[PDB]
Structures are given as C-alpha cells and as structure tokens.
Design a binder for this molecule. Sequence first.
Ligand SMILES: CCCCCCCCCCCCCCCCCC(=O)OC[C@H](COP(=O)([O-])OCC[N+](C)(C)C)OC(=O)CCCCCCCCCCCCCCCCC
Ligand code: HEC
Ligand code: HEM
Ligand code: HEM
Ligand code: HEM
Ligand code: HEM
Ligand code: FES
Lengths: 85, 241, 64, 70, 50, 146, 364, 364
Amino acid sequence: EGHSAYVALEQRVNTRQKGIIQRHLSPYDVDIRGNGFRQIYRLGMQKIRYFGLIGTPCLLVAGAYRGIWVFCERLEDERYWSNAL
Amino acid sequence: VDSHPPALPWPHFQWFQGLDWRSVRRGKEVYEQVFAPCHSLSFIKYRHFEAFMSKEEVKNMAASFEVDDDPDEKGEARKRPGKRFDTVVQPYKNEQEARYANNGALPPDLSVITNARHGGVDYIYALLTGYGRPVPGGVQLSTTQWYNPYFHGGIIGMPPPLTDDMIEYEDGTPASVPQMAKDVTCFLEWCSNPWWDERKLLGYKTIATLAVIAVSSGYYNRFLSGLWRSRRLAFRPFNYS
Amino acid sequence: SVSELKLKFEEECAHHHCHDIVKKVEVCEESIKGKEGKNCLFQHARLWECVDHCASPKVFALLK
Amino acid sequence: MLANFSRFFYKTFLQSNATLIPLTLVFTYXXXXXXXXXXXXXXXXXXXXXXXXXXXXXXXXXXXXXXXXX
Amino acid sequence: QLRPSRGAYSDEFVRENYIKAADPEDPYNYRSRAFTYAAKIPMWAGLLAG
Amino acid sequence: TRVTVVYLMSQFMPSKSSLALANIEVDIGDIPEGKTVTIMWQGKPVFLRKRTDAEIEDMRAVPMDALKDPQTDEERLGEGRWAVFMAVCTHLGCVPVIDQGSYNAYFCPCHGSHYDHSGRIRKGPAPLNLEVPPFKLLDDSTLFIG
Amino acid sequence: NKISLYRSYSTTILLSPAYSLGFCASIFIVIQIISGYILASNYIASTNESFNIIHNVIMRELDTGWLIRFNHINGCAFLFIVIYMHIYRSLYHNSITKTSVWIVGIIMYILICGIAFTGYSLVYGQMSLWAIVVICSLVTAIPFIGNKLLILIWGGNIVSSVTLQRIFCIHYLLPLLLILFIIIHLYNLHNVNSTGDNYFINNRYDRINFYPLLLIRDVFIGSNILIIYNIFVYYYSDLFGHPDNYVPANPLVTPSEIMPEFYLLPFYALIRAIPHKVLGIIIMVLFLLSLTNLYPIYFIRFYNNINILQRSLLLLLLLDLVIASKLCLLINHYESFYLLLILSILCVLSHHIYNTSFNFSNSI
Amino acid sequence: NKISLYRSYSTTILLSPAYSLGFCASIFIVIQIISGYILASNYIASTNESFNIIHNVIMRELDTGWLIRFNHINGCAFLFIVIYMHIYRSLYHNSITKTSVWIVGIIMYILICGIAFTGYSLVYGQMSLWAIVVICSLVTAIPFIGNKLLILIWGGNIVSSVTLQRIFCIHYLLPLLLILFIIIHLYNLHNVNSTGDNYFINNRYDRINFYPLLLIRDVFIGSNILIIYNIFVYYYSDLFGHPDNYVPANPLVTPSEIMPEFYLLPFYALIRAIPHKVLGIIIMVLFLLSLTNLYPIYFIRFYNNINILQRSLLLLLLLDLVIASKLCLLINHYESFYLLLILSILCVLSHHIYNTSFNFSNSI
Ligand SMILES: CCCCCCCCCCCCCCCCCC(=O)OC[C@H](COP(=O)([O-])OCC[N+](C)(C)C)OC(=O)CCCCCCCCCCCCCCCCC
Ligand code: HEC
Ligand code: HEM
Ligand code: HEM
Ligand code: HEM
Ligand code: HEM
Ligand code: FES
C-alpha cells in the first residue's frame, strides 16, 4: 500500500496533517436501527429530486421518439392493410 | 405476419404447480395412435416413459416393436424386439423417403418442438385447432395444401390430423378435437422439457436458501458499517486575529 | 361435443368483438378481385388473431 | 433485556468455536437442509397430488387390471 | 463555515441517534455480542449448505 | 519466421477432400433443347436447362419492378441458352418440381411457389430467387459448375 | 498476523452498493467458467453430432445437465447485463480518470463479446449457422484480401465440422485470457484505488480497511443478484434466446429474421444503419477504437470534473442505444423505421465521454 | 530509455552453456502449445472416430498435419529430456537453496507428467487404452473408496467417449496452468538470481547485464537444440513411441506388453517393485512429496555446500534410474531380473539430496 499511486499522490499534495481528532464507537455500542427511517426518508427525497432533474431531457426526447414511433407504426399498419407493400 | 397464438392458462403455467401427467398420459395415447407414423421423437427412449407409466407396461410397449440387432454369425442383418434402453422407432428410413410419403413436405422432429416455436405450447395448440377456417381470397391451394392461419405463410402441407372421436381414451374422457390438442400439447411439453417439476422445485429451494443468506449477510453488513456511519471529527482551531 | 361450442363461440366473438375487423376484411376482399398477385392472407390472419383472443380461452376452459 | 439469558447463551455456545461450529452445523442440517428444503419438497408434493405421477401410475394399473377382466 | 471545526454530526446528535440504550444490569454488552453472533450463524449455515 | 507463419496458417486452409468436391464438369451435349436435367453437386441438386430463344424473349419482356427479387437475365444468367439453378425453394426447404408452374417453369408444390425460366420468384411466399452457382461455360460439349 | 491482513489495503467510505457490480461480474465469470468446463467434457464439435449431443446427451443422460446448460446460457446473459451496468456507472462517476483500469476494461469488453459470439456458434442450430454466415459476409467486404481471408476463417466455402472445431478451440481458449485480464484490471485498480461516490484525496485516517466489511457487502449484494439470476434459470430459462436455435441447422433454408443476442444488437444496428458495407466495417472499427483512451500519448491531457448536463446526456445515450437495438430488429418488415434507426445511431455516435479542454483556444 | 533496459536485471558471469536448459524447456513448451492448439482444432474425442481422425483426417487431408503431429510428439519427448537435464544440473550445483524456485519446479514437473499422460490417452489406440486401464486399476486399491472413485473418474465401468472427452478437456487445460507456473518460476528466479558454476555474493561491479548477451547465448543454444530436435522429427519420427499405438483399441484384446512412455518408466518401476498395491500407492505419494522441500517449516534450517562425494552419488542415482526403467520393462518375460529391479529401486529410494546438519548432535 505504501508504494501505490494514490499514496504517492497524498504525500505530494497533502501537507503533514496536524490537529485532527477522530472519535469512533465500536459497532456493539451502535444501534443498526439508530438512524434508519430518517436516512431512508432523506435519501428517497434526494433521489426523487435529482432524478426529476437529470431525467427531464431523456423524458423529452423519449416523448418525441414516441410521437415518431406512433406515426411510423400506424403508417405501416395502413400500408399492410391496403396491400400497398 | 401470421396470427399471434392466444395466451392460454396452462396447468403447468401456474403458481407452485407442475405437469398434469394425466394430460401427458392421454397425449402419449394420441401420439401412439395418430402421429407415430408421420413424426419422430429422436430424443425419447422407452425407459423415459417410466415416469407416468408402470415398469411392466413400459416393458410390454417396448417389446411391441422391432429394432435392429447385431449382425448374424454370417454377417446377415437381424431384427429384435425392443427393450427399455432402445430409442423409439423412427417412422421413415431417410429424409427423401419422408418427403416422398408427404407429397414433398418433410414432417419435422417433435422432440423439442415446444422449445422450437414462438410461444411454444400455445402455438402448437393454436396450430392443431385452426384447420377448418375459410380460405382467404386470392389464395390458390393445391390438393395437398391446407389453410392454417397460424403456420408461417398461411399454407401448410399437413392434413388436418385430429377428428372427433378418433381415439378412445382409457380413462373415459371424451376425445374431441380441442381435448386431443390439449393432451398432445401437454405430452409434447413433457417431451421437450421432461424436467419441469424438478426444475421448479430446485428453483424454490435455491431462492429460499439465497434469501436466508441475504438476510443474514445484510444484517452483518449493516452492523459492521456502524463503526464508520457514526464517526466524528474535530479540528483544533488556528490562532487568528 | 366441444367442437360445436367452439364454433358458436368463434361466431359470437367474431361478430361482437372483431366486427370492425370483419368489415375491413370484407372491404379488402372486394379490392383484390381482378388484381393479379394479391391475397387477403394478412387481413384474415388479423381477423383470426382477434377472434381467438376471446373465443379460444372459453373453449379451453370447457375441456379436462 | 434478557441480560442473564444473554450471558448464559454467550458463555455456553458462542464463546468457543468448539461449540459454535457444532451449533452452526446443527442449524445447517436441522433448520435448512431438513426444514426449508425438505419442507418445500413436501409442500410441493402435497399441493400437486391429484395430478401426481404416482397417482397417474396407480390409476393406470387399476384401469389396466379392469380392462384385462374383459 | 469556511473554517471548519467539526465533522457532519454533533456529539448530541450521535448520543440520540446511534448509541444504544443503556442496560444497567448488563455493563459488558453480552446481549449485543450474543445477538450478533447468533444472527451471523444463519449466513454460515446457508453458505455451508450451498 | 516467414515460412513458419505461412505453415501455421496453412494448417487452417481447406482440406484436400473439400477441394475435390469444389468443382464438377457436366457434359451438356446429351441434353436437347427444352429439357431440364437434375444433377448432384456438393449435395445441392442442380437444374440444367438448355434454354431456347422463346424463354429469352419472354424473360427480357419482364420488367424490373414486378419481381419480388429484382434481377434480369443478363444480370444473373449470362449464358443465354443455358440456365443453371440450385433446385431448392428459398422459402423453407423443398425441391421445385419441373414445369407444372403458372409460368411454364419451376414450381414448388410444398406451398406453391412459382419461378420463371429466369429462376425469379413471381408468386408465393418465397422471399428470394433460386441460387445461381458461379457456373462457367466450358467448351461446347461440357459445363464447369463451381 | 490478522492485523497485517486487515491493513494490507484501504479504500474510501463512499463505496455505495453500486460499487459491487465488479464483484457480481466476477461471480458470473466464475459461473461461466465452471459451467463451460463441465459442458466441454461432454461436447463433440461437428455438423453431425453437435446439436444432437447437446439435446440428447447433455440434457437427457446426466442428472442435471439441463441445469448446467441453463446456468451457462443465463450466466452469459447476466454477465453482459452486469457489465453494462458497470460501464454505465463508470461513465456516470467520471471513472475514465482511472486510465489503466479503463483501458483494461475496454479490452475485456471486446474479448467478452468475442467469447459470447463464438460460444453461441457452438450450438449448431439455425440461428448459430446463419449468424456465422452474416458476420462472415461482413468479413468478405474487405478490399483486396477479403475472399481469401474468408476461406481461411472457414476452411472452405461453407461452415463445416472443421469450422465448428476451430470455433470450439477459440471459445475454450479466450475465457482464460479474460481471467488474466481481470487480474490485471484488479491490479491496476489496487494501484490507483476506487473513486467512490465523490472524488476526494484521503489520508490513511480518512480511509477504511477493505477486509472484511467490503467482502461482506459483496457477499450480500451477490446473494441478492444471484436470487434475481436464479429466477431466470429455473422459470425463464429461454427468455434470453430465440426459439429458432432449437431447430437443427439447415444450410438450404434461411430463417425469416436473423437476429443476434440482445447484448450484441447495438453493434448489429451500426451495420444496418450504414448502407455501404466497407463504410460500416470502418465505422465499427473506429467505434471500438474510440471507446479507448490511447490518444493523445505525448500531449499533455488531464481530466476535469463531471456535471449534471453530462449525466443527463448519459441517460440520453442509454435511451438511444435501446431504441437503436429495438428498431434495428424491427426494420425487417416495416421500412418506415429507418428514419428513427438512423436518427438514434447518429445521436449515439455524437455523445461526448471526455470533455476536451482543447475545445477553447486562440489562433496565431 | 534503452540504457534502463540493459540494466533492468543483471546476473553472474559464470553462466556456462548448461544454464540455457531452462530456455530450451521454454522453447519446447511454446512448440507444444502451438502444435497442440493446431491439433485440437481438428480433433473429435470419441471412441468411434478418434483414432480415425488423427490418422486419416489430420495427417492425410491437411497439407502438413503429419508434420504438426510429429512436432507435437517429439516435442513432448524432448521437453522431458531437457527437463531431466535441467533437474540434474540443479542437483549438481546445489540449487535446492533456491527454495521457491525449486518448489515451483517440482510442481511444474508433476503437472507436465500429468499433461503427457492425458495427452497420450487421447490417441485411442491399444497402448493408450490399456495404459489407462492399468493406471485406473492402481486407483482401485484405495481403502474404502476405490470403486466409487474409479466409477466417478471413468464415468462408468469402462473407458468410453465420455472418458475421452474428460481427458481431452484436461489435456487442453493443464498446459495453461503450466504456463502460469512457468511465469512464477521465472519471477522467483529473478528475485533470487542464478547460481552459476560457483556461488558468490557479487556487488553490481561484478555482475553483467542480462540483455542481450544471454539472450544471444540462448538463441545459439536453442538453435543447436532445435537442429538435434529436428533430426528426430524428420528421420526418426516414432523412435520414442510404440507401434502398438498404431492399432485401433480393442477393449476385448490385451497387448502382449503394456509399457508407458519412456519418461514415466521410473514411476512404473516403483509400481512393479512393490507387490502390495496400497503400499505402492503410499510409496508413490511419499516419493513425490519428498521431492519437495516443504518440511521443516518453522524449525531453523540452512543449506551448506556440495562436494565431490555428493556429485558421484548423483551419477549413481542417474545410473540406477535408467537401469530400473529398462529392467521394469524387461521383467515381463524374464523373472530373474526382479532382483536387479528391486536393488535399483532400493538404491534410488535412499539417495541423499539434502545433507542434514541434524545428522550430528548430542543427547540430553
Ligand atoms: C495488452 C493486450 C492488447 C490487445 C491484444 C490482445 C487481445 C486479446 C487476445 C486476442 C485473441 C488472441 C487469439 C490467440 C489464439 C490463436 C488464434 C487463432 O489462430 O485462431 C484461429 C482462427 C480460426 O478462425 P475462427 O473461426 O476462430 O474465427 C471466428 C470466425 N467466426 C466468425 C466463424 C466466429 O483464425 C485462423 O485460423 C486464421 C489464421 C490463424 C493463424 C495463426 C495460428 C496460430 C496457432 C497457435 C495459437 C496458439 C494459442 C495458444 C497460446 C497463446 C495463449 C496462451
Ligand atoms: C399425415 C401425416 C401427419 C400426421 C398424422 C401429423 N402430421 Fe404434423 N406434419 C406433417 C407434415 C408433412 C408436416 C410438415 C408441414 C410443412 O412443413 O408444411 C407437419 C408439420 C407439423 C408441425 C410443424 C408446424 C410448423 O410450424 O412448422 C407440427 C408442430 C406438427 N406437424 C404436429 C403434429 C401433431 C401434434 C400431430 C398429431 C396430432 C401431427 N402433426 C400429425 C405430417 C403429419
Ligand atoms: C473455459 C470456459 C468455457 C468453456 C470451456 C465453454 C464451453 C462451452 C461449450 C462446450 C458450449 C456449447 C455447449 C452448449 O451450447 O450448451 C458453450 C456454449 C456457450 N458459451 Fe461457453 N464456455 C466457456 C466460457 C464461456 C464464457 C465466459 C461465456 C460468455 C459469457 C460463454 C458463453 C457461451 C454461450 C453464449 C454459449 C451458447 C449458449 C447456448 O447454448 O445457447 N462461455 N460453452
Ligand atoms: C469481466 C468484466 C469486468 C469485471 C469482472 C470488472 C471487475 C471490476 C472490479 C472488481 C472493479 C473494482 C470494484 C468496483 O469498483 O466495481 C472494477 C472497477 C472498474 N472497472 Fe471493471 N470490470 C469489468 C469490466 C469493465 C469494463 C468493460 C470497464 C470499462 C472500461 C471497466 C471499468 C472499470 C472502472 C473504470 C473501474 C473503477 C471505477 C472507479 O472506482 O472509479 N470494467 N472492475
Ligand atoms: C494447450 C496446449 C495443448 C493442446 C491444446 C494439446 C492438444 C492435444 C491433442 C488434441 C492431442 C491429440 C492429437 C494427437 O494425439 O496427435 C494431443 C496429444 C498429445 N499431447 Fe498435447 N496439447 C497441448 C499441450 C501439450 C503439452 C504441453 C504436452 C507435454 C508434452 C503435450 C503432450 C501430448 C502428448 C504426449 C500427446 C500424445 C502424443 C501422440 O499423439 O502420440 N501436449 N495434445
Ligand atoms: C517447464 C519446465 C521448466 C522450465 C521451462 C524451467 C525454466 C527455467 C528457467 C528459464 C530458469 C532460469 C534459467 C536457468 O537457470 O536455466 C530455471 C532455473 C531453475 N529451475 Fe527451472 N524450469 C523448468 C523445470 C524445472 C524443474 C522441474 C525444476 C526442479 C525443481 C527446476 C528447478 C530450477 C532451478 C533450481 C533453477 C535455478 C538453478 C540455479 O540458478 O541454480 N526447473 N528454470
Ligand atoms: S417450401 Fe417452397 S413454396 Fe413453401
């Protein structure tokens, strides 16, 4: 791990770290249900908003393609029903 | 394009349910008495019938036919009554012969037929109960051609194979055209997939076991993530004016 | 027998659920009269696809 | 909750692999291989019993005997 | 807010949302150890059978 | 290295036996005009017809649009007097029988396909025309199919 | 030293469950390798015995030879599904910055397409034979040395037993090279580490040990995806296939519609949307070569971040690929769908994966 | 940086031409891989049409399929000759000190023996069938599972096409594992370097660049070895084989003498010199396991020098092995040679490769 590209990068870029205090609890003292429903709600809402954002162009283009698909499908149905093939 | 077969509720297309085996028995009867001389089952052996038939019945059925044997002591050819391990009898010697007995058409092998056609079982049913319809205008039918809307192109070289009261079922069920079509379709479904019930059963067992593993491993993953999901950070401030 | 019931169901379904298809196939039958190399295979296939959607299941329920 | 029972259960079975491994083997056999597997097998056999291969064979032998008496 | 002094969660929050409820009769987490190992057992059993 | 690469590659070239069945030569003098003869080549049956002038005129009168698969006599069948075809119906598999067709030409009775003396499909479910092998006109007493 | 085992490799904490797709693909590679080795032990490659030895020996003489075959088929299909999800995630999170990992991945993708095609060729059925014929007809369009080349590929003017035997050897050989490339893939990744949901440069105090947390997450996600996989093996065994492959090959008859497997359809579209055969070949080669990142080499190039517009365009690319596949299958009967087929293909060919910083510069 | 290429790895100047045996072995591995891949692309494994397609289709229909087959046979023979010389050299210069290199080498030797056996089985001739029968009968002596295991291995009570197909798949697979183990062999060697004629601890000023001097020496020695190898491919093409293998196998008829290939004879001797079957199997396993150096594991051990006495005993080992092979094949007609066969086997089993410093110590 010490001879890895990401370790080399962190040594080149980051300074010698100082003044950082981390606190960790053992999993036997942490409840798996502790922050469950709140996180479910928050993440669901976030993903709903984000997909509503980034999905709009796809929705618009899919609507245009659906219009074209309907037109072509009924054109070909009319062609087949009149022996015009 | 040709007619799309309707989707029918088959007993083996149901929840927690497998082949009927009564339809399979009756379809075996119809196979023996109707299309044994025309179509072939290259993949089915007599011992395969020891699934809905008794051992002695299978033995007698096998002995009812004749099979090639090793050449005589002088090299002469021989015949021999069949056994359990012999494949069922072929109806024709070679393709040419077949084509000669069917006015140029070649009846295909029906060993995997339900797997070889789009919407298999339904299609076969729709093929057999579709023969009497009026011929469309502008279509010229030879003396050995018939109009079946489900065949590719609408014209088929197979004469209507099923007629009412053609076969006397052992269990007493009336042998109408739809009934016989249903029975042969079930029998051919068994021929194509003789592993239906074992496949469904193994599916249930595997899904249940994987579900147990998934629940336990999901709990353990959530437990191990607790160490990091609750981590806390603090930065000692600088001295700013 | 079940065959008579099958024919009855086919007639009912054709005249109650595929009436427009019946009218269309009758229209196309007139068109091809005289024309060379034209057939009503496609229209009749559509008709018998529409009819068997309703007629076929019912018969399939009347047999063991 | 169940502090005393938790201590007892941990000290008895879970503290040592000499007992946890036999415990998990017992769970594998008596609660997965003969409880889910065999149970689903029995359930499948029970639901589909009027159409069973055994049933078909029995009825067949009966009818064959009945026909042989004529 | 551009000179950080803390991570995402404040101590109070963690004391109310992640730390288990204390059991004064069980100060050594025997309950948690027992439950976790027992709930691991099914995974091992399924993997062995498979 | 050059010869070794050539040699390893030559291990994947066609086998001598497949090169013995590649080409055949069929005597053509014995066939009079207005006769269709069936032979066997590569397993595939082959129809050889000593086409006459009437067929040439009739097929030249055929436009290039009424054909499901648009081809012309010179486009597909250079030999004016000889028609060489692969006797296999394009739609499914059947052997078109001699004559008995609505065009006084090849007829597939399995489902009723009609191929003119040019081998071009006119009626029926066949999507294409009869395959024309890359036959070559050898001396006036033989024809080299291959 | 268990501690030394824990700390031998550390990753970021932002590995959402979407980062187990590599492990799922590994599971399916293992399944394919094992099933294929079992099948090959019962397989004879020839035009007189191949189709028969699959449907009359493998699936009816063994206890669960049918199960092995269904595993092989549906495992191929699900391997392709998981690989497509893997690629889509890599594009979504701007993982092209992992240059070694990306190049090795593209090589593996091309190799897997080849493996799937050659394997599908081994069932000497109607679809297998005629797919071989169509692809080789693509081959013979090469200028000058095309026809001879085709002969060398087939060992004759038609597909025959020697063709099946060489295809079998290729199908056996390639997956093992794929295994080696997977090893290289993982080696490069462990050299550069994983992106995570967001890209950060972390010191050891911000990273976590890979073992055993991520192995347990991989087991959990793998069990779920195996449930989904086995639902298809036992109840939809033939959903990812065409029934015409259950008809033994007939060189004298062509099927009504020749269609490849769902995971190769996009490539097929690129051939149907380009009328000129040579132009189609060239465009396919350029497409495959352009998926890589082998140019520039000695010009300074670096990678910037990705944004919402780019993510939305990625979704559009997915839509266009799906539409192109469906339409390229539909154009056989209906000729008015050429418009939408060509439109979707052109839209696919004009999708930006890497935002060229060279877009903006000044003239002399 | 061409200079960096020269200095990437350096070795000792005392590399006599005897240190090209590894390179020659790699040459014959490459030849075997290529010729075997070409053969396998024309091969059908089945008792009905195996012997026929080797002798009637591969050899007589291809342009130089005969040359491919002869290359393959004589390449196996020469690969074993070179490996035996390689092992003899490594024992002569006390190369057991390269612990990792030696262990990987022994694993590779076992793999190659298996590859040779499974390959010889594929020619469904008299010798192949009955060698399989004898070996699998030796399998039948295992306590409490000999018949269950034998049935599992053969797929039945008799060798058949399924057995041929298993053997074909294993023969195809194993050489690729062999290539991986060769890569590991060379990796370890580069880690610990070579011994040379004598062992010295040299600084960089006493070592030479490996490239291109030793590459050119390898080319020269390989050229000479290939001349010698081709003198057999073209003029003695069946010197190492047995004519009974040019007879299609009859399961009903047993050959007069069942003799394996000349590179397995020593093992065969161990079987013939031990009347009890279980004891023979145990001795075989112990022999193969004692060739390795996996014990002691945590006890302190180190290797001292080698001397003239050890080299003389090494010559004696060679003599005993050769005589044992010849006698093992002779004893089928001449019963009095059992004495000399047993004597040679006993002399072989008591040969000291590693002189253990534990031979000298005191008591509590
Ligand atoms: C860092 C990597 C960068 C990218 C490069 C690596 C990409 C991954 C590997 C690409 C494929 C390599 C294939 C090598 C195998 C030989 C190919 C071959 O000859 O195919 C015959 C194929 C046979 O054709 P085919 O039928 O297989 O082609 C498929 C055709 N259809 C469309 C029908 C499916 O080609 C030929 O026969 C043409 C002449 C070949 C001449 C050379 C023969 C070589 C014989 C020795 C091979 C030794 C292989 C084992 C050793 C190496 C592996 C350990
Ligand atoms: C008179 C002999 C004969 C009998 C009896 C017969 N068939 Fe056929 N069958 C044929 C021929 C000939 C064909 C070939 C049709 C074609 O290719 O045009 C055929 C074709 C078929 C097909 C192929 C349809 C397709 O889509 O290709 C099926 C399925 C079939 N038969 C099933 C049956 C069944 C089930 C029976 C028993 C009810 C039966 N046949 C009875 C001669 C027969
Ligand atoms: C060394 C590993 C492999 C071997 C030995 C192998 C061997 C075989 C064999 C013998 C067949 C023909 C039997 C049959 O069709 O059921 C086959 C079919 C097939 N293989 Fe493989 N295979 C291997 C790996 C793979 C991989 C990695 C894939 C890609 C996912 C793959 C995809 C296929 C496909 C698609 C088929 C045809 C599916 C079908 O029968 O319909 N194989 N393989
Ligand atoms: C056999 C198919 C493949 C397998 C088994 C595979 C396996 C893996 C594995 C195990 C990882 C690390 C775990 C992960 O991050 O998901 C990974 C990462 C990655 N793979 Fe693949 N991969 C495959 C195909 C591909 C393809 C086709 C590409 C496209 C070029 C690709 C690109 C990547 C990238 C970019 C990453 C790192 C993503 C990141 O962390 O930012 N892989 N792969
Ligand atoms: C992947 C590489 C290899 C493949 C695909 C392969 C394949 C084959 C095949 C198909 C045969 C039967 C054809 C014949 O007998 O002429 C064969 C025979 C044989 N192979 Fe290989 N082989 C490979 C590598 C090796 C190696 C490394 C050895 C080691 C010496 C070996 C030793 C043999 C032997 C001794 C025979 C039988 C000799 C004989 O024909 O009399 N093969 N191999
Ligand atoms: C596939 C067969 C083998 C190949 C291709 C192979 C290849 C090589 C190569 C290239 C070297 C380094 C160059 C040299 O010193 O000649 C080497 C060294 C060595 N090999 Fe092997 N080898 C093979 C089998 C074996 C076996 C069976 C052993 C027995 C344990 C072995 C033991 C050694 C030793 C001890 C050395 C180092 C000798 C020294 O420098 O003192 N090799 N091998
Ligand atoms: S097979 Fe020729 S007309 Fe149908």
